[PDB]
Amino acid sequence: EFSMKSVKGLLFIIASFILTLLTWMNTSPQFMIPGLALTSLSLTFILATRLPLLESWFHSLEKVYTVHKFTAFLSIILLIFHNFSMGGLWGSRLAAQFGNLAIYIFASIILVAYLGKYIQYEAWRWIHRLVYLAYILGLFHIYMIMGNRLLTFNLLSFLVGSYALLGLLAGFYIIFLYQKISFPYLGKITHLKRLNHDTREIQIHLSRPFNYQSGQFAFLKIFQEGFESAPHPFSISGGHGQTLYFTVKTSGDHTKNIYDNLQAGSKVTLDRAYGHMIIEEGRENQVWIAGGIGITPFISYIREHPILDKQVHFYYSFRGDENAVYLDLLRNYAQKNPNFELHLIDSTKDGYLNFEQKEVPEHATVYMCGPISMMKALAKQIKKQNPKTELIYEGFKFK
Numbered sequence: 001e002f003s004m005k006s007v008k009g010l011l012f013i014i015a016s017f018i019l020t021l022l023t024w025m026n027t028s029p030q031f032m033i034p035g036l037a038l039t040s041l042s043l044t045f046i047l048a049t050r051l052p053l054l055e056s057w058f059h060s061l062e063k064v065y066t067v068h069k070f071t072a073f074l075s076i077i078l079l080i081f082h083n084f085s086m087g088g089l090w091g092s093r094l095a096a097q098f099g100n101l102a103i104y105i106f107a108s109i110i111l112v113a114y115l116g117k118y119i120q121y122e123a124w125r126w127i128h129r130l131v132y133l134a135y136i137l138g139l140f141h142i143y144m145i146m147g148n149r150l151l152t153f154n155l156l157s158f159l160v161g162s163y164a165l166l167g168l169l170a171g172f173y174i175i176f177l178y179q180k181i182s183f184p185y186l187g188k189i190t191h192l193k194r195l196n197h198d199t200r201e202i203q204i205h206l207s208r209p210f211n212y213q214s215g216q217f218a219f220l221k222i223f224q225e226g227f228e229s230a231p232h233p234f235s236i237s238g239g240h241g242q243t244l245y246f247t248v249k250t251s252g253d254h255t256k257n258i259y260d261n262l263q264a265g266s267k268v269t270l271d272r273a274y275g276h277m278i279i280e281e282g283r284e285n286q287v288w289i290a291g292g293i294g295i296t297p298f299i300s301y302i303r304e305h306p307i308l309d310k311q312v313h314f315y316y317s318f319r320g321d322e323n324a325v326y327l328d329l330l331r332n333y334a335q336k337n338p339n340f341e342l343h344l345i346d347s348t349k350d351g352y353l354n355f356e357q358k359e360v361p362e363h364a365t366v367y368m369c370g371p372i373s374m375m376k377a378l379a380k381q382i383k384k385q386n387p388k389t390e391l392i393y394e395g396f397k398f399k
């Protein structure tokens with residue numbers, strides 16, 4: 001649920017709409033529905049830029065993409081109403097046919113994006129990228145139907161041009177430039193370690209120091225023969241300065257390729273650190289809940305803080321002893337730090353981690369990273385136990 005931490009972003013959306021709605025109503029009230037749609041298109045592109053200001057205004061990349069989907073759906077609904085009220089299925093003039101083609105592409109892309117979970121991610125992205133062609137066709141449609149009306153010194157022309165230009169620049173940057181210019185952290189793989197049957201640890205030496213906080217993630221691009229170069233999000237599992245650690249669990253073709261075939265000495269690139277689950281910014285009393293590979297951000301803290309400065313209760317649930325990672329590290333940390341309580345849960349041995357008799361310390365922050373249904377169940381239980389307990393969770397998927 002959205003809170004004040006996203007109030008900067010949502011207000012920016014709201015101010016975007018009213019200013020549009022008040023402008024068209026002042027000049028061409030008959031084009032409120034399509035003009036508003038244009039704004040919601042532009043914002044959509046802006047919401048895909050992954051810029052730091054975006055995740056500062058919306059507090060989370062997950063919330064950024066939720067708003068991205070909301071603006072997409074609003075745009076398509078407004079465009080369908082505009083098409084129904086203005087024309088039909090195919091226009092007579094080229095300007096109308098541009099809008100027809102743009103709306104067809106938009107509807108097809110939204111249908112594929114929603115019902116495209118099982119499509120390969122890169123093919124899904126390539127299909128998604130046709131939004132830029134649809135948007136360019138829509139811009140042509142608008143600027144041929146409205147001629148000098150949008151090419152003069154007035155508020156309507158400046159508003160429409162500013163939003164259209166921002167959308168065009170955002171789309172161009174995210175599609176053509178982001179993977180080429182926004183990945184300045186060039187590193188080499190120095191060490192690889194297989195933690196268990198399906199998890200591998202990767203050590204990267206970078207050319208420049210990398211700044212991050214424990215609990216944050218980054219997008220990684222691997223440059224090796226037989227590997228895909230698309231960026232994948234991975235939680236930083238440790239490292240400081242020019243050294244970075246990533247713990248990758250086999251969850252598909254790319255991660256299986258990492259597990260079996262990734263070699264030392266291969267080139268990698270990283271963009272920057274993302275994430276709102278900064279552990280060091282929480283309260284003094286903390287409860288850490290990890291499920292499986294969701295343990296990765298917490299390890300980042302442990303490797304970087306030899307002496308624990310918080311009172312931390314850690315609950316690590318893993319399916320079996322063969323699915324556990326970093327058990328020796330966790331045991332050594334718990335022995336070294338008296339204020340670190342460790343609770344290992346074996347799902348095939350004892351059962352589910354249930355927060356009904358286990359208590360939450362007063363004025364404590366809960367950090368969760370695990371399977372999403374587990375996170376829902378545990379969040380419900382903890383919220384019922386203490387309504388005034390802060391909960392922060394990190395998801396491992398954008399759609």
Ligand SMILES: Cc1cc2nc3c(=O)[nH]c(=O)nc-3n(C[C@H](O)[C@H](O)[C@H](O)COP(=O)(O)OP(=O)(O)OC[C@H]3O[C@@H](n4cnc5c(N)ncnc54)[C@H](O)[C@@H]3O)c2cc1C
Pocket residue numbers: 120121217230231232233234235236247248249250251252253254255256293296297395396397398399
């Ligand atoms: C913020 C964040 C942090 C993560 N941290 C870790 C971590 O520490 N360790 C770890 O093992 N995994 C982590 N993941 C998950 C990791 O990104 C995916 O497991 C991996 O990208 C899937 O690659 P694949 O081709 O092997 O899987 P696939 O079989 O291709 O995909 C399986 C799932 O991964 C998603 N996915 C696939 N490719 C991408 C992509 N390029 N970008 C985003 N999602 C994709 C699909 O939507 C699907 O839900 C994290 C994900 C996010 C969003």
Ligand SMILES: NC(=O)C1=CN([C@@H]2O[C@H](COP(=O)(O)OP(=O)(O)OC[C@H]3O[C@@H](n4cnc5c(N)ncnc54)[C@H](OP(=O)(O)O)[C@@H]3O)[C@@H](O)[C@H]2O)C=CC1
Pocket residue numbers: 249251291292293294295317318319320323346347348352353368369370371372373374375377394395396397
């Ligand atoms: N932050 C996130 O969004 C995270 C998401 N994931 C994703 O989930 C997938 C599975 O990864 P993996 O690490 O193998 O996960 P597992 O399925 O092994 O889950 C980890 C542990 O959570 C337990 N668990 C699962 N569901 C519940 C539940 N509803 N209530 C209580 N405990 C539960 C499991 O017990 P059992 O399965 O025996 O019931 C297991 O011991 C991956 O694709 C991964 O990316 C995983 C962790 C982090």
Ligand code: HEM
Pocket residue numbers: 031034035036037038079082083086087088089090091092093095096097099100101102103106138139141142145146
């Ligand atoms: C504020 C921006 C817009 C204005 C001022 C506008 C204006 C118009 C007008 C006047 C028509 C009447 C058809 C004609 O000229 O014969 C029309 C039709 C249409 N518009 Fe738009 N439009 C806008 C935005 C959009 C966008 C962004 C899309 C699609 C992505 C779109 C899709 C359509 C479609 C599909 C038609 C029907 C074409 C037909 O059958 O004749 N419009 N628009």
Ligand code: HEM
Pocket residue numbers: 041044045048065068069072073075106110113114125128129131171174175398399
């Ligand atoms: C008018 C509608 C939409 C527009 C203009 C649009 C635009 C974009 C663009 C340009 C990108 C970046 C593509 C790239 O990385 O090359 C993107 C990413 C994304 N879009 Fe959309 N999109 C729309 C609708 C949707 C819908 C309906 C969904 C539903 C799930 C969605 C979910 C996503 C997600 C999850 C990403 C992140 C991709 C990644 O993780 O790399 N979008 N969007």
